[PDB]
């Protein structure tokens, strides 16, 4: 779930506050539906979104409270990375890495202010 989304990109980056940072940045990464990326950092949270549909269509999700923004799957962080840890559930484990993959990508990615709060496109 998004709690969960959140502490990993905290575990790939320690110190940053993401409600904070990642909010309301570039384009697709404040509410998603401007067109054109504008950064490398950018570049992977309409992969985020594009990833979340992914998964809110994917065959293996169908119970209650499935959908990617309330999904409690099973994962971890331990001194350094974070690995998902869920088998059975090859809807629970396909959501983890959206977020383990955009939680990583983030990390490398650079982030730069000048582009924070735009306007438009």
């Given at each position: ?64 409270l499935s959908g990617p923004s ?52």
């Amino acid at each position: 779930n998004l709690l969960q989304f959140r502490k990993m990109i905290k575990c790939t980056i320690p110190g940053i506050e993401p409600l904070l940072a990642f909010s309301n940045y570039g384009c697709y990464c404040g509410k998603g539906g401007s067109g054109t990326p504008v950064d490398e950092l950018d570049r992977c949270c309409q992969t985020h979104d594009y990833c979340y549909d992914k998964a809110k269509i994917h065959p293996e999700c169908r119970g209650i409270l499935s959908g990617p923004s309330f999904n409690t799957y099973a994962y971890d962080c331990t001194d350094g990375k974070l690995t998902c840890n869920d088998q059975k559930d090859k809807c629970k484990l396909f959501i983890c890495n959206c977020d383990r993959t955009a939680a990583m990508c983030f990390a490398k990615a650079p982030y730069k202010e000048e582009n924070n709060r735009i306007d438009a496109s």
